[PDB]
Design a binder for this molecule. Structure first.
Ligand SMILES: [Zn+2]
Length: 46
Protein backbone atom coordinates (compact mmCIF):
# COMPACT_ATOMS: atom_id res chain seq x y z
CA UNK A 1 0.00 0.00 0.00
CA UNK A 2 1.73 3.13 -1.29
CA UNK A 3 -0.17 6.42 -1.47
CA UNK A 4 -3.21 4.38 -2.46
CA UNK A 5 -5.57 7.18 -1.47
CA UNK A 6 -3.85 10.57 -1.69
CA UNK A 7 -7.08 12.54 -1.76
CA UNK A 8 -9.28 13.05 -4.82
CA UNK A 9 -12.84 14.31 -4.52
CA UNK A 10 -14.72 15.47 -1.43
CA UNK A 11 -18.00 14.14 -0.03
CA UNK A 12 -20.59 16.42 1.64
CA UNK A 13 -21.78 13.41 3.64
CA UNK A 14 -19.68 11.64 6.27
CA UNK A 15 -20.67 8.86 8.67
CA UNK A 16 -19.81 10.27 12.10
CA UNK A 17 -20.32 6.74 13.42
CA UNK A 18 -17.12 5.45 11.82
CA UNK A 19 -16.05 8.19 9.43
CA UNK A 20 -17.34 6.96 6.08
CA UNK A 21 -18.37 9.26 3.23
CA UNK A 22 -21.04 9.50 0.54
CA UNK A 23 -22.08 11.75 -2.36
CA UNK A 24 -25.65 11.72 -1.07
CA UNK A 25 -27.47 11.54 2.27
CA UNK A 26 -29.60 8.57 1.21
CA UNK A 27 -26.32 6.65 0.97
CA UNK A 28 -24.90 7.68 4.34
CA UNK A 29 -28.23 7.21 6.13
CA UNK A 30 -28.47 3.85 4.38
CA UNK A 31 -25.03 2.82 5.64
CA UNK A 32 -25.28 4.18 9.18
CA UNK A 33 -27.78 1.36 9.68
CA UNK A 34 -24.77 -0.96 9.97
CA UNK A 35 -24.03 0.79 13.27
CA UNK A 36 -27.64 0.51 14.46
CA UNK A 37 -27.14 -3.16 15.27
CA UNK A 38 -27.83 -5.23 12.16
CA UNK A 39 -28.27 -8.79 13.43
CA UNK A 40 -31.20 -11.26 13.48
CA UNK A 41 -32.60 -11.72 16.99
CA UNK A 42 -31.62 -15.19 18.15
CA UNK A 43 -29.57 -15.52 21.35
CA UNK A 44 -28.24 -19.08 21.56
CA UNK A 45 -24.90 -20.79 22.12
CA UNK A 46 -25.49 -24.36 20.97
ZN1 LIG B 1 -20.35 4.33 9.50
Amino acid sequence: GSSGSSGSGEKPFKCEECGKRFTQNSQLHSHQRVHTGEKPSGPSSG
